[PDB]
RNA sequence: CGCAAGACGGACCAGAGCGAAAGCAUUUGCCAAGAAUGUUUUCAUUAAUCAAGAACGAAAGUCGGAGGUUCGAAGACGAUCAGAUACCGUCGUAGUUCCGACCAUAAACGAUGCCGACUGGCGAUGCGGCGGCGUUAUUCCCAUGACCCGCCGGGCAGCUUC
């Protein structure tokens, strides 16, 4: 299954690669090909239209994209929304994220929704020879970090935000139902990432707070991580300061 | 091959089995072609092939298994070639060639009914063909492209309808042709600033002075001409369903090509609010459609008020969707049933007649913005009793109550973004959404008058932001360098005079205003007043409701 | 393995269809004909049955031409039998086939005249029309196709009973 389904999604990815280039070099140059003045009927629809490249890339690329998306949705999803072992799921998720980033973004809503639903079915399902949750932080931590990085960057990439919010909510829920273990690495990683992604959107207040949180994490990780670097400490203190002095009052209009 | 009797009778016997289950249905066309390419004689005519030519371009119709469909573009071009040839035969010639006897040659079709609506069987065709093109511009799809050769057939049918216009012997000139004219104005009406100002702003002393250039400058007149003309050629029918249809298309021309005054006049004269009730459900869509473009050209002339009231009636509802024939059965829960919403899909509408709804949205939400942010600035300086729901107040409120907004990435959020900037009273925040979201969003990029409407937006923001600033700050003042306000909000003293003058008169402020010295002296207190006037109101509200509780009781 | 001649339309082919009866199965086209059903079209009693008289009418047979593979009266042989001019085996003429004239007969049998009215039940089948919860074909979608259910005509038949 690993060899077959990897080779399937790999064959579909190359058909879309060829389909874009094809449409984006031959047909895209056929489009705006030649002059660019007076379209006879191109100016009239200029009151509610777009460019010629999107207008004819929809004819020769949208197919590939759509197909790939559908496959990813029904593939691992409609064939492996859980089960026992076999990660590959991480790779699938990564691919989906990349696709969303590149092609259409709406896919994020669908993919995200599906993921959440699946997580709910299991977390609030528990009824099958599936994964015997208990102390198996391997797969757990794995999927966790995976979705995290994927969600974080994803949202903080296509200018999404609700998606990022959903991701954070999910992570919080996991921590709640996954607080039975002490705590492994990655923690610091995610913390820093989030604080950063925040910074602006929210006030440098909560952002600076998260920054100080990551700074404190650098202490624990230090005693356990061990980082012999002064520059690091300097940068940390700097980030702390800023995030702090920034706003002395909010304008609650 | 022998005197136009065998020929004619076989005409009969081919135009007979026209309908039934055994048609072959395409080699009747073929066989009409095999009485023409083997029709190579003389006088007799050039002459009477015209009519056969009708019937046979009518083969170039009827092949088609029904009325819902759209016409293999090769079939489409063959149609064209036929019709075009059957302009040839019917300029050159003039005898009218299913009647008016001459010397003879060579007929008989006086004897059936009238030469003449079988003469008038060329307008029929061409209207049909308009309609077939229209059926085209539905099944081809959409942002992209078969699309352009089809647009080109569209050019060519423009051609045809133009042609079907100058000719007119009709019965002579005026007195019914008007419907050619109708088609022609249906293909003049939804066109553009650039082609109402190729006469005026493709430079009129830089353009050619050649009869042809006048035919161009008259071509821009020629539709708003046929208004003045063909009112009487209809002028003459009172039928509410064509009256209420025609005038809605006329009000369109005005506001876009010319004065919004004439547009404002024409609907206000007509009073078609009553008349649309008598009208059938296409003209309902026209009524909605015309209301759009007037609230548009309200905002383009720069009037917040009229653009508000115009675009209000649409934005009370979420039906512009279903009115433009786009609505699902479920897109909330409301929009049943299946077989009935298809009527809208069959009747409505080409893609080249649409407008962006985010445009319509933003243009409405921005018009209201300049009215309501001073209004609420005034209100929260305790002028509140004028607080009105189900308005831009609500539409701003739903977007306001997001805990989580950082940078705006939706057109709603860009309106919310500029709204917050207007509250703070910094010009700066207006410019954000007016530049960036209008590039996103291409709210800006659909008008040559965005250049104008920029200036109209800007100075209003600078004046009303000054006003929102003043509604709060005027407790803090003891006096004002009025010169500062001019410099700071980027305004000039003549206007800032007139502004501050209007303000202190009508907003009923307790400022004393030295206009020659350019000074205000105010000293209007008190910060505790915000509580005191509030409990004074809370008090005063007591007795007033209480008198109703009395008058009910007794 | 190839060629020629003449004959013949298997299985599919059925208490199935069409024709007044005798009869009628390879493909495709042409020529004229007919039943049933549909119809708020036309005519207005124009009908039913039939001496005289008329058309068609299996197979065999006769006359004149063509053809003659196959089968085969007659005939010549071989057996079986007391006898065996037979049943059975071999050969074989007329005939069997086609074209043009005759012949008018059959268990030409449903052994059951034709036209009309009335009087049980039930399930099928061929054809037309109409009504319908649905699957199914295609172009993605009520063109008209196939399958399912019910109803109305007229047709070949069957089952059931104080």
Automatic annotation (TrEMBL), chain A:
Post-translational modification (record): Phosphorylated. Phosphorylation is enhanced upon serum stimulation.
Cellular location(s): Cytoplasm
Subunit structure: Component of the eukaryotic translation initiation factor 3 (eIF-3) complex, which is composed of 13 subunits: EIF3A, EIF3B, EIF3C, EIF3D, EIF3E, EIF3F, EIF3G, EIF3H, EIF3I, EIF3J, EIF3K, EIF3L and EIF3M. The eIF-3 complex appears to include 3 stable modules: module A is composed of EIF3A, EIF3B, EIF3G and EIF3I; module B is composed of EIF3F, EIF3H, and EIF3M; and module C is composed of EIF3C, EIF3D, EIF3E, EIF3L and EIF3K. EIF3C of module C binds EIF3B of module A and EIF3H of module B, thereby linking the three modules. EIF3J is a labile subunit that binds to the eIF-3 complex via EIF3B.
Protein family according to the UniProt entry: Belongs to the eIF-3 subunit A family.
Functional description taken from the UniProt entry: RNA-binding component of the eukaryotic translation initiation factor 3 (eIF-3) complex, which is required for several steps in the initiation of protein synthesis. The eIF-3 complex associates with the 40S ribosome and facilitates the recruitment of eIF-1, eIF-1A, eIF-2:GTP:methionyl-tRNAi and eIF-5 to form the 43S pre-initiation complex (43S PIC). The eIF-3 complex stimulates mRNA recruitment to the 43S PIC and scanning of the mRNA for AUG recognition.
Protein's UniProt name: Eukaryotic translation initiation factor 3 subunit A
From TrEMBL, chain B:
Domain PCI: 351-527
Main location per the UniProt record: cytoplasm
Keywords, alphabetical: Cytoplasm, Initiation factor, Phosphoprotein, Protein biosynthesis
GO biological process: formation of cytoplasmic translation initiation complex
Post-translational modifications: Phosphorylated. Phosphorylation is enhanced upon serum stimulation.
Modification Phosphothreonine occurs at: 202
Keyword Acetylation: no
Entry GO MF terms: RNA binding; translation initiation factor activity; translation initiation factor binding
GO cellular component, one term: eukaryotic 48S preinitiation complex
Annotated Polar residues bias: 200-209
Record region (Disordered): 200-220
Location(s), subcellular: Cytoplasm
Similarity comment: Belongs to the eIF-3 subunit C family.
Oligomer status and interactors: Component of the eukaryotic translation initiation factor 3 (eIF-3) complex, which is composed of 13 subunits: EIF3A, EIF3B, EIF3C, EIF3D, EIF3E, EIF3F, EIF3G, EIF3H, EIF3I, EIF3J, EIF3K, EIF3L and EIF3M. The eIF-3 complex appears to include 3 stable modules: module A is composed of EIF3A, EIF3B, EIF3G and EIF3I; module B is composed of EIF3F, EIF3H, and EIF3M; and module C is composed of EIF3C, EIF3D, EIF3E, EIF3K and EIF3L. EIF3C of module C binds EIF3B of module A and EIF3H of module B, thereby linking the three modules. EIF3J is a labile subunit that binds to the eIF-3 complex via EIF3B.
Function according to Swiss-Prot or TrEMBL: Component of the eukaryotic translation initiation factor 3 (eIF-3) complex, which is required for several steps in the initiation of protein synthesis. The eIF-3 complex associates with the 40S ribosome and facilitates the recruitment of eIF-1, eIF-1A, eIF-2:GTP:methionyl-tRNAi and eIF-5 to form the 43S pre-initiation complex (43S PIC). The eIF-3 complex stimulates mRNA recruitment to the 43S PIC and scanning of the mRNA for AUG recognition.
Protein name according to UniProt: Eukaryotic translation initiation factor 3 subunit C
Lineage: Eukaryota, Metazoa, Chordata, Craniata, Vertebrata
UniProt gene name: EIF3C
């Amino acid at each position: 299954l690993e060899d077959v389904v990897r080779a399937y999604l790999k064959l579909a990815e190359e058909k879309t690669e060829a389909a874009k280039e094809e449409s984006q070099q031959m047909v895209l140059d056929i489009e705006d090909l030649d002059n660019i003045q007076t379209p006879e009927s191109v100016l009239l629809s200029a009151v509610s239209g777009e460019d010629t490249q999107d207008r004819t890339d929809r004819l020769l690329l949208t197919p590939w994209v759509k197909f790939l998306w559908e496959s990813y949705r029904q593939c691992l999803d409609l064939l492996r929304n859980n089960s026992r072992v076999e990660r590959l799921y991480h790779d699938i998720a990564q691919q989906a994220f990349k696709f969303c980033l590149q092609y259409t973004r709406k896919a994020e809503f669908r993919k995200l929704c599906d993921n959440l639903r699946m997580h709910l079915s299991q977390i609030q399902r528990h009824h099958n020879q599936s994964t015997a949750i208990n102390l198996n932080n391997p797969e757990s931590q794995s999927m966790h970090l995976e979705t995290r990085l994927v969600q974080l960057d994803s949202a903080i990439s296509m200018e999404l935000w609700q998606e990022a919010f959903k991701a954070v909510e999910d992570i919080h829920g996991l921590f709640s139902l996954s607080k039975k273990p002490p705590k492994p690495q990655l923690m610091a990683n995610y913390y820093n990432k989030v604080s950063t992604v925040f910074w602006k959107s929210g006030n440098a207040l909560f952002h600076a707070s998260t920054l100080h949180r990551l700074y404190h994490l650098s202490r624990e990780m230090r005693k356990n991580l061990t980082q012999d670097e002064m520059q690091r400490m300097s940068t940390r203190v700097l980030l702390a300061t800023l995030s702090i002095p920034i706003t002395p009052e909010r304008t609650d209009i | 091959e022998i005197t136009h009797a065998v020929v004619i009778k076989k005409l009969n016997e081919i135009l007979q089995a026209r309908g039934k289950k055994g048609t072959d249905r395409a080699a009747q066309i073929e066989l009409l072609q095999l009485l023409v390419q083997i029709a190579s004689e003389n006088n007799l005519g050039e002459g009477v092939i015209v009519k056969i030519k009708f019937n046979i371009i009518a083969s170039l119709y009827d092949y088609n298994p029904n009325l819902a469909t759209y016409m293999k573009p090769e079939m489409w071009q063959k149609c064209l070639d036929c019709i075009n040839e059957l302009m040839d035969i019917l300029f050159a010639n003039p005898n009218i060639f299913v009647g008016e006897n001459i010397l003879e040659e060579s007929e008989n079709l006086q004897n059936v009914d009238q030469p003449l609506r079988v003469r008038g069987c060329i307008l029929t065709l061409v209207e049909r063909m308009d309609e077939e093109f229209t059926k085209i511009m539905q099944n081809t799809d959409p942002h992209s492209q078969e699309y352009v050769e089809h647009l080109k057939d569209e050019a060519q049918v423009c051609a045809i309808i133009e042609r079907v216009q100058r000719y007119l012997e009709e019965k002579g000139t005026t007195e019914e042709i008007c419907r050619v004219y109708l088609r022609r104005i249906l293909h003049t009406y939804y066109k553009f600033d650039y082609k109402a100002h190729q006469r005026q702003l493709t430079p009129p002393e830089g353009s050619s002075k050649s009869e042809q250039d006048q035919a161009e400058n008259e071509g821009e007149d020629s539709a708003v001409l046929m208004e003045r003309l063909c009112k009487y050629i209809y002028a003459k029918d009172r039928t509410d369903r064509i009256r209420t249809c025609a005038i809605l298309c006329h009000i369109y021309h005005h506001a876009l090509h010319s004065r919004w005054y004439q547009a404002r006049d024409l609907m206000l004269m007509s009073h078609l609010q009553d008349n649309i009730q008598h009208a059938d459900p296409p003209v309902q869509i026209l009524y909605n459609r015309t209301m759009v473009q007037l609230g548009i050209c309200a905002f383009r002339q720069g009037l917040t008020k009229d653009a508000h009231n115009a675009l209000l009636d649409i934005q009370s509802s979420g039906r512009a969707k279903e009115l433009l024939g786009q609505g699902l059965l479920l897109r909330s829960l409301q929009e049943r049933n299946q077989e009935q919403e298809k009527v809208e899909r069959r009747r409505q509408v080409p893609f080249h007649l649409h407008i962006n709804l985010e445009l319509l949205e933003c243009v409405y939400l921005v018009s209201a913005m300049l009215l309501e942010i001073p209004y609420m600035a005034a209100h929260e300086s305790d002028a509140r009793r004028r607080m009105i729901s189900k308005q831009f107040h609500h539409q701003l409120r739903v977007g306001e109550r997001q805990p989580l907004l950082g940078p705006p990435e939706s057109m709603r959020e860009h309106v919310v973004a500029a709204s917050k900037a207007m509250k703070m009273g910094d010009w700066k925040t207006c410019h954000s959404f007016i530049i960036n979201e209008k590039m996103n969003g291409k709210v800006w990029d659909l008008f040559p008058e965005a250049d104008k409407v920029r200036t109209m937006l800007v100075r209003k923001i600078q004046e009303e932001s000054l006003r929102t600033y003043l509604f709060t700050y005027s407790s803090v003042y003891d006096s004002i360098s009025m010169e500062t306000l001019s410099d700071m909000f980027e305004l000039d003293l003549p206007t800032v005079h007139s502004i501050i003058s209007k303000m202190i008169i009508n907003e009923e402020l307790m400022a004393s205003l030295d206009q020659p010295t350019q000074t205000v002296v105010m000293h209007r207190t008190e910060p505790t007043a915000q509580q005191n006037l509030a409990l004074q109101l809370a008090e005063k509200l007591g007795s007033l409701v209480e008198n109703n509780e009395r008058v009910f009781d007794h």
